[PDB]
Amino acid sequence: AQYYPGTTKVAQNRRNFCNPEYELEKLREISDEDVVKILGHRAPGEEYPSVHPPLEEPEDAIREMVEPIDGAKAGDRVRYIQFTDSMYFAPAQPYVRSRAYLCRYRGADAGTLSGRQIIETRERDLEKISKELLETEFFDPARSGVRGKSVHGHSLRLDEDGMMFDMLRRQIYNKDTGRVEMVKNQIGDELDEPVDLGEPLDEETLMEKTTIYRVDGEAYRDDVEAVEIMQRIHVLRSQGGFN
Amino acid sequence: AKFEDKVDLYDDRGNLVEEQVPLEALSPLRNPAIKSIVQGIKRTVAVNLEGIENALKTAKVGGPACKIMGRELDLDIVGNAESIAAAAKEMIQVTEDDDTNVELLGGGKRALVQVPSARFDVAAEYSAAPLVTATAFVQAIINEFDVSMYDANMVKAAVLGRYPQSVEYMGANIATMLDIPQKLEGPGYALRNIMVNHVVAATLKNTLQAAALSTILEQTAMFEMGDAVGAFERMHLLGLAYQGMNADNLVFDLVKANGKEGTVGSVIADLVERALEDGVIKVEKELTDYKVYGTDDLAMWNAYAAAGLMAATMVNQGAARAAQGVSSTLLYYNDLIEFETGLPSVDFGKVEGTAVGFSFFSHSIYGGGGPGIFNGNHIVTRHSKGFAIPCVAAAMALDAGTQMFSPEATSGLIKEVFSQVDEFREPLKYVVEAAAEIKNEI
Amino acid sequence: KTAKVGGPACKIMGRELDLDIVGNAESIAAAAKEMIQVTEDDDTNVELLGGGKRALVQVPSARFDVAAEYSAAPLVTATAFVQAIINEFDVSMYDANMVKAAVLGRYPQS
Amino acid sequence: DKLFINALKKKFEESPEEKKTTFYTLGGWKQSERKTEFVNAGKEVAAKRGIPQYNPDIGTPLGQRVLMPYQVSTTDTYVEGDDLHFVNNAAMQQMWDDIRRTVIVGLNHAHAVIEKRLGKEVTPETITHYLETVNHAMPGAAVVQEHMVETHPALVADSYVKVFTGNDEIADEIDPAFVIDINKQFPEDQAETLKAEVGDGIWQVVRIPTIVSRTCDGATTSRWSAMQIGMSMISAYKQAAGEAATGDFAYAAKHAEVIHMGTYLPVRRARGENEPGGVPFGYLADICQSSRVNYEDPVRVSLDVVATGAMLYDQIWLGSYMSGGVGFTQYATAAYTDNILDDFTYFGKEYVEDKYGLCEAPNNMDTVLDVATEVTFYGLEQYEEYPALLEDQFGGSQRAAVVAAAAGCSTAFATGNAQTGLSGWYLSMYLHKEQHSRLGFYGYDLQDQCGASNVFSIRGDEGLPLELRGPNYPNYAMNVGHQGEYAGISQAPHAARGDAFVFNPLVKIAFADDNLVFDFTNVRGEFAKGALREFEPAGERALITPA
Amino acid sequence: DKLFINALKKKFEESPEEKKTTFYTLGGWKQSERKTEFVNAGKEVAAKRGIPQYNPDIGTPLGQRVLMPYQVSTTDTYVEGDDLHFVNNAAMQQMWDDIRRTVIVGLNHAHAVIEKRLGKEVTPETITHYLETVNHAMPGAAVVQEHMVETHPALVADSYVKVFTGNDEIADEIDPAFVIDINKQFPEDQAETLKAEVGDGIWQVVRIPTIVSRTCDGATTSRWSAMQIGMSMISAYKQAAGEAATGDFAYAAKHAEVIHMGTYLPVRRARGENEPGGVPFGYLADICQSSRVNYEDPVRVSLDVVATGAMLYDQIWLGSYMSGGVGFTQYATAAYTDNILDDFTYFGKEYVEDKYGLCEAPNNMDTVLDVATEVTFYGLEQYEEYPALLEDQFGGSQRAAVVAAAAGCSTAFATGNAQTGLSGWYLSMYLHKEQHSRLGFYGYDLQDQCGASNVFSIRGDEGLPLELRGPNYPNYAMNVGHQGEYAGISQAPHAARGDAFVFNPLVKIAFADDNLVFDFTNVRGEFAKGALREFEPAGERALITPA
Numbered sequence A: 001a002q003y004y005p006g007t008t009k010v011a012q013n014r015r016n017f018c019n020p021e022y023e024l025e026k027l028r029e030i031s032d033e034d035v036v037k038i039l040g041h042r043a044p045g046e047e048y049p050s051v052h053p054p055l056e057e058p059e060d061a062i063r064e065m066v067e068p069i070d071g072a073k074a075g076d077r078v079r080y081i082q083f084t085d086s087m088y089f090a091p092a093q094p095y096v097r098s099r100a101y102l103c104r105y106r107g108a109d110a111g112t113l114s115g116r117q118i119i120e121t122r123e124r125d126l127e128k129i130s131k132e133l134l135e136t137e138f139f140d141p142a143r144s145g146v147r148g149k150s151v152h153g154h155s156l157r158l159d160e161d162g163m164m165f166d167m168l169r170r171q172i173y174n175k176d177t178g179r180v181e182m183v184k185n186q187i188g189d190e191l192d193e194p195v196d197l198g199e200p201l202d203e204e205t206l207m208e209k210t211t212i213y214r215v216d217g218e219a220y221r222d223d224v225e226a227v228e229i230m231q232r233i234h235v236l237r238s239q240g241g242f243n
Numbered sequence B: 001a002k003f004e005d006k007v008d009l010y011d012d013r014g015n016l017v018e019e020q021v022p023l024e025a026l027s028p029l030r031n032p033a034i035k036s037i038v039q040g041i042k043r044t045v046a047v048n049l050e051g052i053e054n055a056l057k058t059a060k061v062g063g064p065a066c067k068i069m070g071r072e073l074d075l076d077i078v079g080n081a082e083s084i085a086a087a088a089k090e091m092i093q094v095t096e097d098d099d100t101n102v103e104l105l106g107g108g109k110r111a112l113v114q115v116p117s118a119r120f121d122v123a124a125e126y127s128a129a130p131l132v133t134a135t136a137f138v139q140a141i142i143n144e145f146d147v148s149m150y151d152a153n154m155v156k157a158a159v160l161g162r163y164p165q166s167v168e169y170m171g172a173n174i175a176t177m178l179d180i181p182q183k184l185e186g187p188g189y190a191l192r193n194i195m196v197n198h199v200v201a202a203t204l205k206n207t208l209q210a211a212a213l214s215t216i217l218e219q220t221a222m223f224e225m226g227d228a229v230g231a232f233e234r235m236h237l238l239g240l241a242y243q244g245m246n247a248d249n250l251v252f253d254l255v256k257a258n259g260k261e262g263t264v265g266s267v268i269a270d271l272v273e274r275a276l277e278d279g280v281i282k283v284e285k286e287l288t289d290y291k292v293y294g295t296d297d298l299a300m301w302n303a304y305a306a307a308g309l310m311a312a313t314m315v316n317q318g319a320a321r322a323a324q325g326v327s328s329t330l331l332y333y334n335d336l337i338e339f340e341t342g343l344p345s346v347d348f349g350k351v352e353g354t355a356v357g358f359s360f361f362s363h364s365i366y367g368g369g370g371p372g373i374f375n376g377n378h379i380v381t382r383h384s385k386g387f388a389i390p391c392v393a394a395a396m397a398l399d400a401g402t403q404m405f406s407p408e409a410t411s412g413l414i415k416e417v418f419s420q421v422d423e424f425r426e427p428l429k430y431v432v433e434a435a436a437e438i439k440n441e442i
Numbered sequence C: 001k002t003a004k005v006g007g008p009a010c011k012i013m014g015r016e017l018d019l020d021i022v023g024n025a026e027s028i029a030a031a032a033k034e035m036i037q038v039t040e041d042d043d044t045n046v047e048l049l050g051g052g053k054r055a056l057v058q059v060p061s062a063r064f065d066v067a068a069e070y071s072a073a074p075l076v077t078a079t080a081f082v083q084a085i086i087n088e089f090d091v092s093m094y095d096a097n098m099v100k101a102a103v104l105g106r107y108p109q110s
Numbered sequence D, E: 001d002k003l004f005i006n007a008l009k010k011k012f013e014e015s016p017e018e019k020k021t022t023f024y025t026l027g028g029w030k031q032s033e034r035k036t037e038f039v040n041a042g043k044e045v046a047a048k049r050g051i052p053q054y055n056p057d058i059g060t061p062l063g064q065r066v067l068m069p070y071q072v073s074t075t076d077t078y079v080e081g082d083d084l085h086f087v088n089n090a091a092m093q094q095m096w097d098d099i100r101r102t103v104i105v106g107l108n109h110a111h112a113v114i115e116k117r118l119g120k121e122v123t124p125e126t127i128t129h130y131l132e133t134v135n136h137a138m139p140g141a142a143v144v145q146e147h148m149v150e151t152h153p154a155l156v157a158d159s160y161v162k163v164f165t166g167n168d169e170i171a172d173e174i175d176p177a178f179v180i181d182i183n184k185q186f187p188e189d190q191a192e193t194l195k196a197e198v199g200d201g202i203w204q205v206v207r208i209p210t211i212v213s214r215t216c217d218g219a220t221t222s223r224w225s226a227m228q229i230g231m232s233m234i235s236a237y238k239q240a241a242g243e244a245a246t247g248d249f250a251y252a253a254k255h256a257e258v259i260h261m262g263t264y265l266p267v268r269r270a271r272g273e274n275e276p277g278g279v280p281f282g283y284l285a286d287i288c289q290s291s292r293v294n295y296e297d298p299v300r301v302s303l304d305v306v307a308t309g310a311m312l313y314d315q316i317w318l319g320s321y322m323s324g325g326v327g328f329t330q331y332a333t334a335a336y337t338d339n340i341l342d343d344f345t346y347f348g349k350e351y352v353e354d355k356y357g358l359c360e361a362p363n364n365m366d367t368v369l370d371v372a373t374e375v376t377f378y379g380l381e382q383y384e385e386y387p388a389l390l391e392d393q394f395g396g397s398q399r400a401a402v403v404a405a406a407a408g409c410s411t412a413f414a415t416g417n418a419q420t421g422l423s424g425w426y427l428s429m430y431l432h433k434e435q436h437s438r439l440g441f442y443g444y445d446l447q448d449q450c451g452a453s454n455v456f457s458i459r460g461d462e463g464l465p466l467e468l469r470g471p472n473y474p475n476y477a478m479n480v481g482h483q484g485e486y487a488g489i490s491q492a493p494h495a496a497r498g499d500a501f502v503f504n505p506l507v508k509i510a511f512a513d514d515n516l517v518f519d520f521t522n523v524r525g526e527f528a529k530g531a532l533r534e535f536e537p538a539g540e541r542a543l544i545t546p547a
């Protein structure tokens, strides 16, 4: 699959996120316990609450052909993880996430907004996905944020440390260490022990990995082949609706 | 036949049934089974005899939390259901041995009623089914117990509710699949104002049978709305065949090839391959490491893309066993396939647009609800002309119990009664057989 | 011809289209009947009246055997005559919406 | 003495029995303080705006007869009829606004979604936290997003959310500021009936701002309510601010467990929810709170409902929504002024009480023919013996409504059944028509002639118990002088029976609330207070306007 | 300088180009004068009523960033966003009331019935006598019957009836107090177009009282109008007060020659006539009177329509009628604050003027692909170069609506056709979505994705010229950030062409009236006046309420 047209770094970064054969660059190591703490749906070691009994406990050719994910077999709840991406060269961006999620992950419910992007799926499968979303180049601890509510910041100016605005301040930059610590879960509840999220990517690497077009980076109007395809779809949609 | 297209018909198990069937043999205007499905929906009414008895016994009539103290009537309606149903059928029928059907269910607690077709041959719309059924059972109950003139109005309230003070049958103890004609978003929408939960309930949560029935209802309404007329008729017939009828086993094969490990993106890649394999699309232009695809048959590309859309829904929401992600699948299958190919998505963007609001109005505060409460006459999901609702019926069929407003909560009377008719419960069977029987008359 | 569409005293200046519809009413009505009819031998009837100024249309009964109510008659007739007028004069994509407003009015806003 | 004698003596100098008086020498409109105020105001209006307006010389000259004052029944307040026009009476406008801006929303499905789909606990402590959250958000304030602009708390001070439940122990655990205390508002036997009807259910009574209700329409109420319920559910129970389960609360609040005051109307009289035409007669009887404060006097309870409905249905609904202009003020005041309907109805009550005993009469046509005929003849004879009474209620429609309301309510006092009371209403009309060879206006008895055969019909758009009927019942959809009285006949048998409610116990509880602006326990007393320009309504824009 | 620079400098201490600022140290809600007023008011409100209300400690703490002031575009008025909430802004409420209480009723059929069926004469002198009669009766005063009670003339001082006609001699013969003079209100070339459209027809502009419109609903307007027209026809032309021919006037006034501001809505969004959802985009452009005072600046005319529509459709209609609560104030203020949309649209005008010249471009997709793409890139680049601008219009929906409106209006400036302007609107969305990998809220581009295929469709519920579409167009029925801008795109090609009207010449003339309360020639200026609490609305009850 080609996934997306264009000849800029942005276009290639969008293809890289969508291509399941592209191995996402791992930038940090996060423990399983910290991921469960960041999600905030259950305490580490707490059993998965069930919305319905396990599947083993009707006749359908589709049901027999589509292998369910492990969380659906057990009857786990559908929980979420939600990210906010700064328009100042965050590596991932809202529509890039949803497009990439439905190429890479099974049983995914993705939603795109300007100030947030959410995926809902079975709880134990979300934890496996959230690990990759938090450890890889999908996430930057300064220009990106895990936010279940009060997501204001994607379009705001940065603070003195280069951190994106957060009404609840879930991610704290440490001036002494140069690393970001997550002091609350994505809904804003204080954690017992913060989770180290590593150092923010420098401005050189952000522009190398970002998927947003900007005039002070790579402008969308200069990626003439990408614009041409969007204009082509607009014209073909118009003609199809007429006849 | 107006069109040259022919399709190979398959069953809900991926087995070939009939090869090279003209496209219009599946048309609602020609297929006798689709005619039997549409006419059956118009004339079928469920009567809750137990609910009527409980309403009369408690004087709880006319809407939620409503009661008139002092109006209680203790009538053994369920105990006398045989005599009551026999008297009602005598008033419902036009002549003896016509197609009037009255059957008791649940030991007399329920009643399946099918108003004779002769009443509809001289009627403008479909309201004769509940109105004749309600008044026949009201009269039958009154005659059975000799309810006095001063008490009979409570039997009327117990059966049909607060009508005509309310516009609807508010608090009634009868149910149909269609709603009152006043609630149509527009003329010709009546076959769309059928809740997805209603379809899933009476299909008994079979994915392919729910998908076929939803497509049958949606595309048949496209004929009544005038959308499937002239330049657009072939597009709607092709969409009916490939997306809802498993034409050429395309939906089935796509689901089979991506069922164990596949995603929406993997279903797209296989669908684009199949369209290129079958000559539906061809490389029109080459950009920098990007092939621009074109087609000389937009209606056929739309049908192929619509098949993969249904298959992507079955793969994505089937793996999760939760229907809620169907709004995401309907959106990004179409978003991804446009930048994958350079061709317009299903319904030329209208499925993607419908999915945007459907995602919103099923994950926010401003209205909507669960996927099962939507329908073609909902303001949120009326915009795509028959290509989006069938995927929701397939998704709700795969939901393993994650919905508060499931068909068991909003369509309980439908699941018990309307599923008993074999035409509605397994429509893929009869529509394929009927198309084969008329293949040489098209 | 006057761009007076969509209700009483309504007009969109600059949208005027001069089409000789009545002069070609025979070809237009024949083209519409081809879209209104189900088969060549159903009970579809399209007749011109007043020298082509009017048209009597009877939508075939086969469409109502698979319809819930009666709105198929105006909706199928309206879109068949809209398409027939557009095909007759090759009305461009950018002007065709005026033919739709002239036939069916302000629906679906009203 | 007859209850209307004092009012008649206040109106005219002659004795009530005198058949002669003098006309044409009263000075026209100059006899009236109110008309004089209007003439001076019309001059100022025309002068300020440069267009003629009120002019007593247009058309025919008002005031060739006595321009009567009216006694508001059950009070000693005497006003000119112009003071009872809904445009001139802020108490009447606020009564409708208080109904229009109210909706009842259950918490039972929502709490089930919280515990099952979200796996979180619901306790009286969480309900209190939610209620404190919703009473901040409901008037129009933010709880989640950053940089939100909000409504002025003083402009929306009348909007709030309360809850009630039949479980006394649960009710005592919720913060009492948010609880409608059934045990404090209703007498013992009524409170036990209502608490038994509600059971373990928890129901919200939501009132949106009057200023919004006046700016928008009735259909806004349930939507405005649902948005702020949904936001407060997100905040109080720590949901993601927009996930899949959030859609359940929206559907629950907008459709699943919502009780509208009025259902929507068909196209010819196109109107959304919470408009007067959608309010059934049973709801209107239950909105009126006379039942819980005058429960020993079923006549007083029934006639307070008549006053509620006559003003709403005839003056605001039929007199403005469906027509307009000068309106139907005196068409309605005939039913709640001068103690005229009171005298007629207290007669029928005593007649029924002595002959049958309340609710002891047979529920058949014999009781209808007896009670309705006796009360009708008594009522019509009062106009024949007191010429000042006949000149007071000068319109035949007025008289037909008052006489039949007494006959209908009395028949319902006897049978304990509202349907035979309705049959007595129409019999009263037929006897009235024959006695005086006249009835109402040109089209008064459309429903009245359809009446007898449709009382006990069971057909599609004909058969309904009176409690379920309303202004949208086909025969009733057009004409003045009926709907408000039908609401009184619906209240009549339940008031005599001692029932806590007529049709919906949740509606009855929803208006037993001291934080309402209009006092629904004293409807006629509120009408008099608004006529005297002493009523303080909500929704004014004075705070955001210059001095 | 860019037109938005001044507003950005007033909002923040940093220069508009700076990418960094400081947060969290502003004191929360204490940074704002308005929030401080709300906190104090909520404390007083809660104490007075005994129920908690506004509480800044509920939910999340507002004010971690700068709580911005907003410049009302084309003015020098700076207010906090709460002052532009429709509940807090009496000018916004009065703008909608002036539309809701207005109806246009022809006199042409009525005068024909008088002369043919009644055999009586109609002259300019009789029309003046009728107009003097109707301006007494329309506010709620009697002309025929004895012992009528009337509305207080001071409470209904805003109700009146005027007439207009294209015949200068007929207009000059009617008393000028009742005449909307087309020659005085419109420039010459516009006046000739309107007078040619009206011809010898005589049309009434009826405005019923604001206090009634707020008490009732929009469907009251045409009924209230018809009642008082009929009574004045009976009085002025000496009919029997109720004969057969009287029925003709009623049907004429209620159906035959009546122009509603809004048509009724279907059941799901059940509403009668004259509600915002029924007002098509062409009517809204003609209601706005910027066209007759700013006819030399097609950008100024188009954006005054955007301001008119964004407030009504998003804040009142979608933000209250269809939802409610805190609402959609800033979803709409993005389109009429800080001169942002002005800067974007003046760019596209000059681009079109320099490259094509206004209305000289081909009406095809080539012009769409060129102008819409160029204007879109300009709009998005301003957010990229001015971080304060991106922090100002922080919501993606806000940005998508502003950018696409400029692209749509500019494309319409080029083609002189609103349908290609609409196509440019949706193209802007597609380019915007791909450039920033984001667009609007969760469900912003439902219509935006359906857009391209439905611009030139001809099918039943898909095909309509943009002037005929409105809030009931199926794709448009739900979502913010479109409807007000669609009205501006409807105005754009006619403003560039110099047309006197967009869709209905009678609607355009009917609001060229200085006796209106709201000044529709200066919509944004009126919004600023209401934000400063200096606007005096109609419909207040102060006269009938205690001090």
Ligand code: F43
Residues within 6 Å of the ligand: A113, A114, A115, A116, A148, A149, A150, A151, A152, A153, A154, A155, B363, B364, B365, B366, D137, D141, D142, D143, D144, D145, D146, D148, D149, D227, D228, D231, D234, D241, D242, E324, E325, E326, E327, E328, E329, E330, E331, E332, E394, E395, E396, E397, E398, E439, E440, E441, E442
């Ligand atoms: C709970 C929801 C989900 C839903 O159905 N509506 C919400 C909330 C609702 C509430 C918020 C009131 C409160 O705070 O109590 C209100 C005011 C509607 C109401 N009930 O009165 C509203 N949104 Ni929302 N909402 C808005 C917006 C937005 C933008 C904000 C993006 C950002 O980065 O700040 C995003 C959608 C997007 O990503 O594009 C958004 C989301 C959301 N919106 C998320 C909450 C997001 C969060 O947790 O912070 N709104 C806007 O884009 C601007 C206008 C603004 C509206 C208020 C106004 O117009 O003045 C408000 C309109």
Ligand SMILES: C[C@@H](OP(=O)(O)O)[C@H](NC(=O)CCCCCCS)C(=O)O
Residues within 6 Å of the ligand: B361, B366, B367, B368, B369, B379, B380, D254, E268, E269, E318, E319, E322, E323, E477, E478, E479, E480
């Ligand atoms: C969707 C539909 O609601 P229901 O799903 O029917 O509850 C519809 N409301 C709306 O469209 C809400 C519009 C305003 C809130 C969203 C603004 S983006 C309506 O009430 O008719």
Ligand SMILES: O=S(=O)(O)CCS
Residues within 6 Å of the ligand: D441, D442, D443, E241, E242
């Ligand atoms: O004379 S009519 O009875 O038509 C009018 C009654 S208000």
Ligand SMILES: O=S(=O)(O)CCS
Residues within 6 Å of the ligand: A113, B360, B363, B364, B365, D241, D242, E441, E442, E443
């Ligand atoms: O977050 S949502 O887009 O659903 C709400 C927008 S106000």
Ligand SMILES: [Mg+2]
Residues within 6 Å of the ligand: D517, D519
């Ligand atoms: Mg008081």
Ligand SMILES: [Mg+2]
Residues within 6 Å of the ligand: E517, E519
């Ligand atoms: Mg002024």
Ligand code: NA
Residues within 6 Å of the ligand: D213, D214, D215, D216, D217, E213, E214, E215, E216, E217
């Ligand atoms: Na109102």
Ligand SMILES: [Xe]
Residues within 6 Å of the ligand: B177, B198, B199, B202, B203, B213, B418, B424, B425
């Ligand atoms: Xe079904």
Ligand SMILES: [Xe]
Residues within 6 Å of the ligand: B330, B354, B355, B358, B381, B388, B389, B392
């Ligand atoms: Xe859908």
Ligand SMILES: [Xe]
Residues within 6 Å of the ligand: D291, D292, D294, D295, D301, D494, D495, D496, D498, D499, D500
């Ligand atoms: Xe009572």
Ligand SMILES: [Xe]
Residues within 6 Å of the ligand: E291, E292, E294, E295, E301, E494, E495, E496, E498, E499, E500
């Ligand atoms: Xe103009």
